[PDB]
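Archive entry. Fields below.
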Amino acid sequence: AYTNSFTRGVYYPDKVFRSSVLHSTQDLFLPFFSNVTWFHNPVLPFNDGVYFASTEKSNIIRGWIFGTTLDSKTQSLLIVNNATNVVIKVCEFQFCNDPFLGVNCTFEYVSFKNLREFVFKNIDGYFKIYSKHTPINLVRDLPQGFSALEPLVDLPIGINITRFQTLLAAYYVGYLQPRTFLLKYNENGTITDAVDCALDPLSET
Amino acid sequence: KCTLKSFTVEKGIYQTSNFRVQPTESIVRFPNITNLCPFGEVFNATRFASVYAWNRKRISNCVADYSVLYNSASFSTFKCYGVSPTKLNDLCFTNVYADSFVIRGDEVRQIAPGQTGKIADYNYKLPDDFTGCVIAWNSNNLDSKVGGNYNYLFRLFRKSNLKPFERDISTEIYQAGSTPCNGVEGFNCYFPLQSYGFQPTNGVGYQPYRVVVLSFELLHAPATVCGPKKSTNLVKNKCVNFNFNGLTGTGVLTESNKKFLPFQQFGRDIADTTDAVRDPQTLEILDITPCSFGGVSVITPGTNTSNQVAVLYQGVNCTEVNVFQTRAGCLIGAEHVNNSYECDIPIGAGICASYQTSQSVIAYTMSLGAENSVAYSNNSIAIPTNFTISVTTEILPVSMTKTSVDCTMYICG
Amino acid sequence: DSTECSNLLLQYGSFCTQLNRALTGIAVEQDKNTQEVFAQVKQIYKTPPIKDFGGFNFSQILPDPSKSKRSFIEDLLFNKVTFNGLTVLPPLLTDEMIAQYTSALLAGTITSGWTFGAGAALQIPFAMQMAYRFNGIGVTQNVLYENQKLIANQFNSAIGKIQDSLSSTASALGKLQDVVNQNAQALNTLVKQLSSNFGAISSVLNDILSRLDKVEAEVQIDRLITGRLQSLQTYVTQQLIRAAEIRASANLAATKMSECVLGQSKRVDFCGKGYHLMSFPQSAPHGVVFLHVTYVPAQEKNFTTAPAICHDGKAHFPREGVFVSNGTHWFVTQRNFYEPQIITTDNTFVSGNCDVVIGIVNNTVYDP
Amino acid sequence: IDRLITGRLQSLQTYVTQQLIRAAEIRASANLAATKMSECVLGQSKRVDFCGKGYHLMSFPQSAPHGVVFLHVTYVPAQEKNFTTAPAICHDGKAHFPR
Amino acid sequence: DSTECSNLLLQYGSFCTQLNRALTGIAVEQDKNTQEVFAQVKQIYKTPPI
Ligand SMILES: *[C@@H]1O[C@H](CO)[C@@H](O[C@@H]2O[C@H](CO)[C@@H](O)[C@H](O)[C@H]2NC(C)=O)[C@H](O)[C@H]1NC(C)=O
Ligand SMILES: *[C@@H]1O[C@H](CO)[C@@H](O)[C@H](O)[C@H]1NC(C)=O
Ligand SMILES: *[C@@H]1O[C@H](CO)[C@@H](O)[C@H](O)[C@H]1NC(C)=O
Ligand SMILES: *[C@@H]1O[C@H](CO)[C@@H](O)[C@H](O)[C@H]1NC(C)=O
Ligand SMILES: *[C@@H]1O[C@H](CO)[C@@H](O)[C@H](O)[C@H]1NC(C)=O
Ligand SMILES: *[C@@H]1O[C@H](CO)[C@@H](O)[C@H](O)[C@H]1NC(C)=O
Ligand SMILES: *[C@@H]1O[C@H](CO)[C@@H](O)[C@H](O)[C@H]1NC(C)=O
Ligand SMILES: *[C@@H]1O[C@H](CO)[C@@H](O)[C@H](O)[C@H]1NC(C)=O
Ligand SMILES: *[C@@H]1O[C@H](CO)[C@@H](O)[C@H](O)[C@H]1NC(C)=O
Ligand SMILES: *[C@@H]1O[C@H](CO)[C@@H](O)[C@H](O)[C@H]1NC(C)=O
Ligand SMILES: *[C@@H]1O[C@H](CO)[C@@H](O)[C@H](O)[C@H]1NC(C)=O
Ligand SMILES: *[C@@H]1O[C@H](CO)[C@@H](O)[C@H](O)[C@H]1NC(C)=O
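PREDICTED_STRUCTURE:
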């Protein structure tokens, strides 16, 4: 199944305050009105980076795995919500080939009603995670609107990543691509709107 | 005179220089010094390794004061290779490997890049291009025991010499004879592991010494280990040279109303110039103002008439530099006058200056002309009863001097 | 303030001195441009305490002492138009001095006509000044004195529409706003060019010096020096070309000050469309606004006409005016306003006889 | 030598550019001086302040190095008296206006 | 149309935008210059048949 992404998947590109101003940036972004895969947990490509979101009232998603194999042969990233903490581990895990969660290593770290949104990207040896939470009033698609994702963590991991999988009532996957965006910063220095400059001739204008 | 390349100066206002306030001091700020590397075990542990079985810590995602390794008198020798011991606190690395063992005091000189000897051949080998440092100290107080501490051992022979960082703890029988040993002693077949038996009364070459070797690398994976960061006190309202988290600049720091979001660190202006910062320890937001600067202009009557001058510091507040503030800048050596005259030398923002009555440079608000109520009413007219023929002179430029340049003669010739 | 860069910049010699000499010549010219428009008045004329101007209502355009003492329309104009070693210098004349000049130009114009430009301001009643400005366009002055309340109401109503227009479009003030926008875009471009590499390792000058050995850093800095010096030469050349365009516009504004405000221009479409009566200056940010007052003819009728009339074999021509007929009777009118006069020997003059002229008509000429 | 060529060629391009911009300024002044020759030496201008202050009578050219000088002769009124005035006068119930 | 040269020309920043902006201002001025001269008439007047 597939759905339209609308104007979603924007994140703060840098840790800089700007206010009551428009700023133009090139980065990996989810293109506006792009086409995104919908699921009601297969291994998927990661490409340049992933936008991931779930529409929820029951907290069924519990983590992710990222790497090349996600299994024993070579190093990989495991991310799990342990309910008291987010936990991140970077290891050649002996963990399951068809994994589920319910009732050596080089790095480690410890921390429908809702749309929970995340961006994962891996550039110059750093792994970036961005996120947002919002209440929602729609089930059938990602709800039309705007909300910029703030950076959660920014990790010195250095690994080659090419594929990923979910650990776990429905979720969406979209792919980042190199794009130029024009971002609107309000007086509080929050991103409040954006233009995808490659979408259409008015957006180029 | 030196600006104009002349000994005679005509009446005017001349920009001769630029004024610029200098930074009063330098400031440096980084986050609270935290997350010490696990060396708190490495130099204090009760247990330690036999040299045939050397113990490695892997050091990552941390900082430490690497100067303590030679600033502290606790260590009997310190050595460094590729790196310099005084430089260590400025450096960063992807990993560091901290390799540790006990040896007798005569063996200590073998612990260097690419060496040969009973340790380097059979117990612990360093590569020829090693980058890092060695800590070594007498441990007769830690590793010796009455009747001998037999828990410490070395390998006396090996079938092949160790490769760099090879770690052979195996009970392999060494072969010197033409017959294979098959895992048991025999004709020139020897069990090669030997105990030191360290005693408190040993001579210094037979006393135990502890060693730690700190082995450095920077990879395709980013740095995770660094030396410590300094942090000065913070000074507001003075012009200073500054560094926040490696963002360098110079200017005046002032308290500000700007509410950055919790992840934001810097503020930027419309033209991408940094206009504010978060302090990395006490998380206030400071505005940055440029360190004060402007042109310097000398206001002079002609040197045919006086050698007195006034000086204008353009756009400068007189606090930063008779002395008189004008909206054009701080004006020095000119007398402020309450009269107004035609503009002689133009200063700016309605102010002019002249040389006048013991005579000095004066500065005044310019006069636009004499004030006049025209005697208007609905039935009054004025008519001229007489005239004057006037002859005005108008001068207009019409041509330049005609120039030619042979560009090949000018450039080359 | 990099000392390593400062020593390299000395190799280029006079370039940095002549950029400042060029921008200084541009800066001095902006004060001359302003002086030549507004400082055309010898004395600061002021308007009488009571406004007995024949029903013409100068109040939107004269100073308001409740406010800089700008007029009401000058306050609309000032509301509508809206550090890397770079500095902005104040003008010589303040916005309050520019408004004292437009106040004096306007007060002299209202109380004395054209006379304050040619000598001393000679007072004249405003309805008598307008009667002369009607004669200046070839309309007889009795046309003003017979229509004075209508003419004053049309003027007062037309000034009222200037408040409405200035409160409800940007399309006219776009000329002054574009001069503000071009100078702001030029300085933004000059500042953004500090972030460029020009093929150097970095755009940040301390980040070159702190990460390279002396001879290598020197080669990287010389690329920043070359590109930043070319970035200044491009800005200063573009400001020189733009200053020549502003000087042409300031010389035109100084000419409309003399010929439209201090005079009554006979030049077609120089002081607005229609036959020019007078105009008033108002100050604006970086500019001047002229309120050009013109007579426009408005309700024409067709008539039959003849070049001459034939009387006692004599051909008669009008001294001023044109012969016209309503179909049955012949009259002479002034040319720009229908006012038929009976044809007489003092409305007209003779030349030769009726056989010569193409299209002459037979008529009586009354001899008083 | 290529560093000298680069800098001397940029130095000479700067000179020619500023002489082109200065020649345009001198041409505007020569076009004005040619217009004052026609409208004030060959004529009598009715344009206010085009040829001196006061009402223009005539003007005379004198040559100067790289330029022209106009001696502009003007009538300036000098010694005014105040009078009462009226727009028109009655006579036989008709209004009269000054011709 | 070389991609290798284009990524070197990006290192010179605003120079190539302001050259195109200068020539576009000159181009729009030529149509203004033409309408200042010829468009001085409000209605397209015609001469009679005779
Ligand atoms: C042309 O104008 C004359 C103006 O004198 C008109 O003739 C007058 O008409 C009025 C009545 O409309 C009479 O009271 C006058 O006695 C007439 N004067 C004369 C001299 O006869 C004439 O009617 C107009 N013709 C047209 C076709 O409009
Ligand atoms: C989304 O992807 C599917 C892939 O089969 C395609 O059929 C569909 O047309 C796409 N929709 C849009 C809007 O591109
Ligand atoms: C800007 O920030 C202040 C302080 O948090 C807040 O009161 C205000 O409502 C914010 N304004 C907007 C437009 O978000
Ligand atoms: C750093 O230390 C000071 C003094 O102990 C403390 O006030 C401050 O809260 C610490 N920094 C942070 C980021 O909490
Ligand atoms: C700066 O100048 C203003 C007047 O322009 C003056 O009031 C102020 O006291 C000066 N600044 C300081 C720090 O004194
Ligand atoms: C000059 O003006 C100031 C402020 O109005 C006043 O205090 C001072 O007494 C005046 N001095 C003279 C000599 O007029
Ligand atoms: C009379 O004329 C003179 C000269 O123009 C003028 O100064 C004076 O003000 C006039 N008289 C009155 C009563 O205003
Ligand atoms: C007019 O002025 C001249 C001096 O310019 C004087 O000699 C002459 O007497 C004056 N005539 C009258 C009528 O005032
Ligand atoms: C002139 O116009 C103003 C409004 O512009 C009005 O208030 C005033 O009554 C009018 N008449 C006079 C004589 O001022
Ligand atoms: C009469 O005058 C009007 C107004 O100028 C004009 O439009 C009309 O063409 C004229 N009559 C004829 C028959 O042409
Ligand atoms: C005017 O034109 C008509 C034809 O339209 C002609 O008969 C007549 O002779 C002409 N008259 C003059 C004065 O040219
Ligand atoms: C005009 O009058 C003369 C003398 O009465 C006569 O000869 C001539 O034919 C007349 N012309 C016209 C056009 O009626």
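CURATOR_NOTE: Chains E and D do not touch (no CB pair under 8 Å).
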